[PDB]
Amino acid sequence: STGSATTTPIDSLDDAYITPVQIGTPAQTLNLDFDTGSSDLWVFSSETTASEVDGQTIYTPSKSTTAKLLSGATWSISYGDGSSSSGDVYTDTVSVGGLTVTGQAVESAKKVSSSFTEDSTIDGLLGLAFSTLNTVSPTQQKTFFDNAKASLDSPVFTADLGYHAPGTYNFGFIDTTAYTGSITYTAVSTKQGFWEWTSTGYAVGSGTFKSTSIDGIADTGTTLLYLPATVVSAYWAQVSGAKSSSSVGGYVFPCSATLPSFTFGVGSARIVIPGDYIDFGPISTGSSSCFGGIQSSAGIGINIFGDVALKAAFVVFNGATTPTLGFASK
Known part of the structure; x- marks a missing residue:
């Protein structure tokens, strides 16, 4: 069924x-x-x-x-x-x-x-x-x-x-009509009860891809993308006027800015998050400061690939006896 x-x-x-x-x-x-x-x-x-x-x-x-x-x-x-x-x-x-x-x-x-x-x-x-x-x-x-x-x-x-x-x-x-290209599958660890996998790196905009292992969970119940401080800092350094704000509790940026895309690695494949996906709008009605969709995981203890990242892909949750996660462009 x-x-x-x-x-x-x-x-x-x-x-x-x-x-x-x-x-x-x-x-x-x-x-x-x-x-x-x-x-x-x-x-x-x-x-x-x-x-x-x-x-x-x-x-x-x-x-x-x-x-x-x-x-x-x-x-x-x-x-x-x-x-x-x-x-x-x-x-x-x-x-x-x-x-x-x-x-x-x-x-x-x-x-x-x-x-x-x-x-x-x-x-x-x-x-x-x-x-x-x-x-x-x-x-x-x-x-x-x-x-x-x-x-x-x-x-x-x-x-x-x-x-x-x-x-x-x-x-x-x-549904093989819902994506383009191939599905790239990657190993899942169930040791903490999450759909936990390891991303193979990242790129900011059209910059060089940085090969580095980012261990994190696929979480449809979390809105944003939470990554290590080093990655998040490198992303927002490319947005003019962006800064981390303690009063707001994260990175904000001038709403007039254009955001660069963010690429994350799945084995040898790459999933590209368009910059528009990272714009979460004014911090308050009428404000010219906008809230960023990529935030630091330092306070969380775990990296979270939330809706911001998952909605850029067709994602297979394979619950076979050896579970895996599949990512495909769409």
Whole structure:
């Protein structure tokens, strides 16, 4: 079996992407953020503190004939950006673009952090990292991809994120019409539970390619690209008037500047990020300072190839027993 679903940016800056997901019987459709950087499927629900719900669609297990409370199970998550939520656990039927999993752990949020509350367009997260990061206690739960792996034609899913435009998540097959050239595959380490791989280098604009290993994770749930301080400094040195700002917390640049592209290596292949992808607009309404899409990972501890980089490519998440990541130009 296979599944295919359209993913849509939530705003004009591509800060996140939402994908419709059907939960329960009859179907309750929620718009979830597909996150390859976490492993929990959690939703706003009827159980969420009503003061913490600001326009989201909520999952109501009492209206689902296939929902079953998972007795004694709880969950609690803290995200890299200091966000948190927690609650209890149901199992239910979950379908993504025609692909159906029965008995999927659906983690119902009892309380969410304010950052999720402020964001009325995201009804929850669907984690697609490896199931060893799932936070359900005392019995850890499998991700939607892990539960679907057996019935998929091929144990893969692909991310085809759009620039200011809709994209596609496919499960179980590789659409050979969605990319150009060849797919270059690279090894994945699962030792920390992430889709972790090693980039072979970078170039700024049309400068020389610098061969250097950059270990990092493919994270659809992170907006920006976070790279080591040396790389980020070399990029912004080519933008006139750019500087790192402590008050803003990152590199900013004059909105009148034109940004150079950024190339990152995948084995012997090269993925080019157009400079327009790196512009994230004014830091405040009416400001002439614009926020940069390439920031330092020094405070994070891990390099993150977020949406800025992934949307420049067709990305295959190969969940075979030896997992790999595939990149192709598009």
